[PDB]
C-alpha cells in the first residue's frame, strides 16, 4: 500500500499538499531545491515521518451509522443540509444516490430534490415509518419504490448464508418433522389484519434486521472451533507472568583518566580532646582584617566574575536590519540543512554514498564561500560596525561545518591516502 519509503517519496501530490499546507516549508523547500538544487528525495528523506503522519491523517474514514434514524422531520420545514451527511446518505443508500444522479443533473435542483425526498413515501419506507396510502409522497422519488424493493430482494439474497448447527434454530425446529399437536395461540403467533393480510410490522422488523445485517457485513469487508468455543475457563489454571527478574553484580572500576597512621591520629585525637575540654572562645574567631581583606578580594572577584556571567541571562532583541536578519537566518537554516544531510551521508557509511558525500562537501564549501561573501557585504554595508556581530552570529554553524569538512578530509587521507 501507500506506506513504503518509495510510496511516500512517490506521492508528489501529497508532498505538494503539505507543502501548500505549510509556509516555512515553501521557504525551506524553495531554498533547498529551487535555490540550492538539492535532490528533493533527500529533502523529503528526513521528513518521512511527517509525510506518513500527513498521509494517515488524510487517509482515515468514518464507520457506518443509521443516518436516516439521525434524520429528524423537524409549521414549516427549512432544509439545513450537511454535505458530509448527504454523501453518508448516498453511501448508505445507493438507490438514493442513483435517484440523485439521474434527476438532479437532468431535471431539477438539489434542494428541490431533497424537499421532494423528504416529501416522498420512499423516504418514510426507508426510515422507520409505516407506509400509508393517505400519504401521497413524491411521485418522482416514489417511482423508485419497486427498484428499492428488488434491491432489497437482491440484498437479502446476498445476505443469505449457511448457519452453524450449534446455534441453528432451524435445525432445532427441524428436530421432529412429524410434530402433530394443536394450532398455537393467536397471541403468541404473528398477528394479521382483519382480511388476513399482515399490517407489515414483520416487514419493518425484517427491514431493520436487514439494516443490522448490512452493518455487520459492511464491517465484514476486505479491509473444530467449537472445542475452543466450549472451553470452561473458570476451572483452569491462572496465568502467571514469565517476566524475568534482574540481579546486579557490582564491581566498578576505580576512578582513572602519603598514608595516615592510627598512632598519629590517636595522638592528635587525644590532644584535640584535651583542647576541647580545655577551652573554646567565640571572640578569637574575628580575623586580622588583612588576610580577611584578601578574602574580601577573592569574594568580590568571584562576585564580579559570576555577575558578568549573569549579565547575559522570540529570540534576543537585536539591532539588525530586518531583511539582512531574515537573510542570515535563512542562510543559517539552509546551512544547517546541508550539514544535517552531509552528516546523514557520512554516518551512513557506504561506497554508494561517496559521490553524495563529495557533492555535499562541495555544497558546504559553496556555503562557506557564500558566508564569506555575505561577510563582505555586511563589511561594506557597515564598515564593521556591527558586521562583527553578523560574523559572530554565523560563526558556530560555520565552525561546525568546517569541522565536518576537516573530518571528511582526514578520513579521505585515512582511506585513500
Amino acid at each position: 500500500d501507500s506506506l513504503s519509503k518509495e510510496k511516500l517519496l512517490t506521492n508528489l501530490k501529497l508532498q505538494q499538499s503539505l507543502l501548500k499546507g505549510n509556509k516555512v516549508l515553501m521557504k525551506v523547500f524553495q531554498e533547498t531545491v529551487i535555490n540550492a538544487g538539492l535532490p528533493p528525495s533527500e529533502f523529503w528523506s528526513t521528513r518521512i515521518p511527517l509525510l506518513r503522519a500527513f498521509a494517515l491523517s488524510t487517509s482515515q474514514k468514518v464507520g457506518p451509522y443509521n443516518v436516516l434514524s439521525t434524520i429528524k422531520p423537524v409549521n414549516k420545514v427549512n432544509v439545513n443540509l450537511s454535505r458530509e451527511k448527504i454523501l453518508n446518505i448516498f453511501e448508505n443508500y445507493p438507490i438514493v444516490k442513483k435517484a440523485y444522479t439521474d434527476n438532479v443533473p437532468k431535471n431539477f435542483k438539489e434542494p428541490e430534490f431533497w424537499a421532494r425526498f423528504f416529501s416522498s413515501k420512499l423516504f418514510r419506507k426507508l426510515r422507520g415509518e409505516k407506509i400509508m396510502q393517505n400519504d401521497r409522497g413524491d411521485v418522482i422519488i416514489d417511482r423508485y419504490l419497486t427498484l428499492d424493493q428488488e434491491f432489497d430482494r437482491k440484498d437479502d439474497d446476498m445476505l443469505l448464508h449457511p448457519v452453524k448447527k450449534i446455534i441453528d434454530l432451524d435445525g432445532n425446529i427441524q428436530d421432529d418433522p412429524v410434530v402433530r399437536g394443536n394450532r398455537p395461540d393467536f397471541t403468541m403467533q404473528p398477528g394479521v389484519d382483519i382480511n388476513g393480510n399482515s399490517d407489515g410490522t414483520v416487514d419493518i422488523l425484517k427491514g431493520m434486521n436487514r439494516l443490522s445485517e448490512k452493518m455487520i457485513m459492511a464491517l465484514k469487508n476486505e479491509y473444530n472451533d467449537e472445542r475452543n468455543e466450549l472451553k470452561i475457563d473458570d476451572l483452569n489454571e491462572s496465568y502467571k507472568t514469565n517476566y524475568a527478574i534482574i540481579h546486579l553484580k557490582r564491581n566498578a572500576h576505580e576512578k582513572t583518566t602519603l598514608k595516615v597512621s592510627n598512632q598519629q591520629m590517636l595522638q592528635q585525637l587525644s590532644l584535640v580532646m584535651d583542647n576541647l575540654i580545655n577551652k573554646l572562645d567565640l571572640n578569637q574567631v574575628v580575623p586580622n582584617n588583612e588576610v580577611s581583606n584578601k578574602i574580601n578580594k577573592r569574594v568580590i572577584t568571584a562576585i564580579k566574575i559570576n555577575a558578568k556571567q549573569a549579565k547575559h541571562n522570540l529570540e534576543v532583541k537585536s539591532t539588525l536590519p530586518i531583511d539582512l536578519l531574515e537573510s542570515c537566518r535563512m542562510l543559517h537554516t539552509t546551512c544547517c540543512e546541508f550539514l544535517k544531510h552531509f552528516y546523514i551521508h557520512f554516518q551512513s557509511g557506504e561506497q554508494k554514498q561517496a559521490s553524495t558525500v563529495k557533492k555535499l562537501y562541495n555544497h558546504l564549501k559553496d556555503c562557506i564561500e557564500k558566508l564569506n561573501e555575505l561577510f563582505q557585504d555586511v563589511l561594506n554595508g557597515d564598515g564593521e560596525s556591527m558586521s562583527n556581530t553578523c560574523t559572530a552570529y554565523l560563526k558556530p554553524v560555520l565552525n561546525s561545518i568546517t569541522l565536518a569538512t576537516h573530518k571528511y578530509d582526514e578520513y579521505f587521507n585515512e582511506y585513500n591516502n
Partner: peptide, 21 residues
C-alpha cells in the same frame, strides 16, 4: 530519467504558483 523531469517541472510550476499567492 526523462519522465521524472516533467514531474519535478510540474513541481517547479506549483512552487512558482504558490509564491505569488
Amino acid at each position: 530519467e526523462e519522465r521524472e523531469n516533467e514531474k519535478t517541472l510540474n513541481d517547479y510550476y506549483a512552487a512558482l504558483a504558490k509564491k505569488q499567492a
